[PDB]
């Protein structure tokens, strides 16, 4: 029974190459395959090309790379993929995204004075972060959301870099300005970057306000301890006097605490201030109530010369009962009955930043333990029984120095993998989760689960790779009869960045001449770093600090053929505003948010594994996945 299946990204994209994995099970000889794509509904033939032949020398796996043109509301538009395997035709409708790529705006400074010039560059790249030549529309709005200047340049042959500039008139409103840009082929998708306009003057020293703890324990007698560090822009320590105050925040409203105002000296460029719990409680009129709210510190340092003055501020200090938080957002919500289930505990501090080195465990198994890595994820693994009853797991932090009362707990519920016709045939993919780095190799484990009556029928696994919303690679993993565990040497390149998924499935005939498909997906995180590398150090491999007006060599170590844009800014500027900058970490954070996968791994059934990994399965036997018609992932239902 020749089974012709097809797999394409859950959501296709315009003006981009999307892969399409063709297949043919139990097929003899060759087979002429013709892939075609039409608009929906009706027929307009957006792409008729791309035809290949499945050779038995390749285990009958095809590979067709296609591209959907433009030829241009509120309702999504769909396309109809049509793969004809010789005579038998198999078609499936897929959602299409109007997103052509991303746009990154960069401004030299973070704040500008009325009369100066703003230098901003627009980076134009695709979904693969590779430069591209398109038409970009750039506007500039004032604080009251009113466009004043609009351009229409093209990154054609400009290597994806659009240098621009605009002079700010003396007569203009101060506040928060915004620069909005978007591709001409997608007005709905707009990117923006803000720059403040204010009449200011660069100070001569910065002020840092760091509380001992990145939070506050309500039952802490000592109180909120805060350290005031002040140093000149050139590094030298600062001598002066600081004025520090506190307050409580509630959503958007702030309540100052006049009785917390302190005036501490600043010697050796350091200061020490404490907010006693007594004054805090007296600030209101039920300590357990303040739980959830936040505290903010407002310092103000003045030199002993009374020449300069700087105002700093730390806001967002959480008031919680436990110094930690647990999230099962990186743990699959489906387990395999009678198979080792992996738990990816995600411990984080009250603020949101991952917590390093914090032991965790399960409700039972007092002996089981695991520490948290640098990413904020712990490695846990439990053995389940062949029961089709939901598995309830409660993970408990086991960090010493504290008590069972100061610990944070969380409970989740995993559901068994529903096998087609209750045949109890499962597939588990266990991954040695460590901080993956481009260049290493990953040991992908394939654990089979089925009676021997049909185990000899399984001879290969079909795995696919998901990356940035596209099919990176797809191959076959051989399997000999009697093997429940086979390893797949998957080499990690610079493409897997940031995160890549791995779906694996097998198909056979059993039970009662009924076609069955079993799958399992897994989401792994790779080290977050530059796809290549870019370093900027001092050319002078010797000497000390330069002198105003002096020259200095500036070494730049980057990739060959790459263009590098530079910019130097006085640190004094960041003392007034350090927000809305451009960081490589902020880039990956955006890429990850645009992921089509909405599950750490596994699923309720075979049709769920693919869908929960950002894939669509469709065969000639009938086994298909759940219809997806919603752009965003599931509305996070706690």
């Amino acid at each position: 029974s020749p089974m012709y299946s097809i797999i394409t990204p859950n959501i296709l994209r315009l003006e981009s190459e999307e892969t399409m994995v063709l297949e043919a099970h139990d097929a003899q000889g060759d087979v002429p395959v013709t892939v075609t794509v039409h608009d929906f509904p009706g027929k307009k033939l957006v792409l008729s090309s791309e035809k290949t032949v499945l050779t038995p020398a390749t285990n009958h796996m095809g590979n067709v790379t296609f591209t959907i043109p433009a030829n241009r509301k509120g309702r999504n538009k769909f396309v109809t993929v049509q793969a004809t395997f010789g005579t038998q035709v198999v078609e499936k409708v897929v959602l299409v995204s109007l997103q052509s790529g991303y746009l990154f705006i960069q401004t030299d400074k973070t704040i500008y004075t009325p009369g100066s010039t703003v230098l901003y560059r627009i980076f134009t790249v695709n979904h693969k972060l590779l430069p591209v030549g398109r038409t970009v529309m750039v506007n500039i709005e004032n604080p009251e959301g009113i466009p004043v200047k609009q351009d229409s340049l093209s990154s054609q042959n400009q290597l994806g870099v659009l240098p621009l500039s605009w002079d700010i008139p003396e007569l203009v409103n101060m506040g928060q300005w915004k620069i909005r840009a978007y591709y001409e082929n997608s007005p709905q998708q707009v990117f923006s970057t803000e720059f403040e306009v204010k009449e200011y003057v660069l100070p001569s020293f910065e002020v840092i306000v760091e509380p001992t703890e990145k939070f506050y324990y309500i039952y802490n007698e000592k109180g909120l301890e805060v350290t005031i560090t002040a140093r000149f822009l050139y590094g030298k320590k600062v001598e002066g006097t600081a004025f520090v105050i506190f307050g409580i925040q509630d959503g958007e409203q702030r309540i100052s605490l006049p009785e917390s105002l302190k005036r501490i000296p600043i010697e050796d460029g350091s200061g020490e201030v404490v907010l006693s719990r007594k004054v805090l409680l007296d600030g209101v009129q039920r300590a357990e109530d303040l739980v959830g709210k936040s505290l903010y510190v407002s310092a103000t340092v003045i030199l002993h010369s009374g020449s300069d003055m700087v105002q700093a501020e730390r806001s967002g200090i959480p008031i919680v009962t436990s110094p930690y938080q647990i999230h099962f957002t990186k743990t699959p919500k489906y387990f395999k009955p009678g198979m080792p289930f992996d738990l990816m505990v995600f411990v984080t501090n009250p603020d949101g930043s991952p917590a390093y080195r914090v032991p965790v465990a399960v409700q039972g198994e007092d002996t089981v333990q695991s520490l948290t890595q640098g990413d904020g994820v712990a490695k846990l693994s439990i053995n389940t029984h062949p029961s089709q009853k939901p598995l309830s797991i409660t993970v408990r932090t086991k960090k010493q120095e504290l008590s069972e009362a100061e610990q944070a707990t969380r409970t989740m519920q995993a559901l068994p993998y529903s096998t087609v016709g209750n045949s109890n045939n499962y597939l588990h993919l266990s991954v040695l989760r460590t901080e993956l780095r481009p260049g290493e190799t990953l040991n992908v484990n394939f654990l089979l689960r089925m009676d021997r009556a049909h185990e000899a029928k399984i001879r290969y696994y079909t795995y696919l790779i998901m990356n940035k919303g596209r099919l990176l690679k797809a191959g076959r993993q051989v399997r000999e009869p009697g093997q429940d565990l086979v390893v797949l040497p998957l080499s990690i390149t610079t493409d897997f960045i940031p995160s890549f998924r791995l779906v694996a499935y097998y198909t056979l005939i059993g039970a009662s001449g009924q076609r069955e498909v079993v799958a399992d997906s897994v989401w792994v995180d790779v080290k977050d770093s530059c796809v290549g590398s870019l370093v900027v150090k001092s050319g002078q491999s010797e000497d000390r600090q330069p002198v105003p007006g002096q020259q200095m060599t500036l070494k730049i170590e980057g990739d060959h053929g790459a263009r590098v844009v530079l910019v130097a800014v006085d640190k004094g500027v960041f003392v007034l505003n350090k927000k809305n900058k451009l960081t490589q970490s902020k880039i990956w954070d955006v890429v990850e948010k645009a992921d089509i996968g909405c599950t750490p791994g596994s699923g309720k059934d075979y049709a769920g594994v693919f869908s929960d990994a950002g894939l669509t399965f469709t065969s000639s036997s009938g086994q298909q996945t759940a219809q997806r018609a919603e752009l965003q992932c599931p509305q996070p239902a706690a």
Binding site: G115, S305, G306, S307
Partner: protein
């Protein structure tokens, strides 16, 4: 060490203040020629 200086702007526009200083016995020095905006007497307003 701070050093006071009383001045009175006479003409509007981007004017220029310049101070220099040298140490005795030591052969070191440094002058600063910064510029400050000199605006007349009035108040902002946005009449419709």
């Amino acid at each position: 060490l701070s050093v006071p200086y009383v001045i009175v702007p006479l003409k509007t526009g981007l004017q220029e203040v310049e101070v220099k200083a040298a140490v005795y016995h030591h052969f070191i020095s440094d002058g600063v020629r910064k510029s400050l905006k000199v605006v007349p007497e009035g108040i902002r307003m946005n009449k419709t």
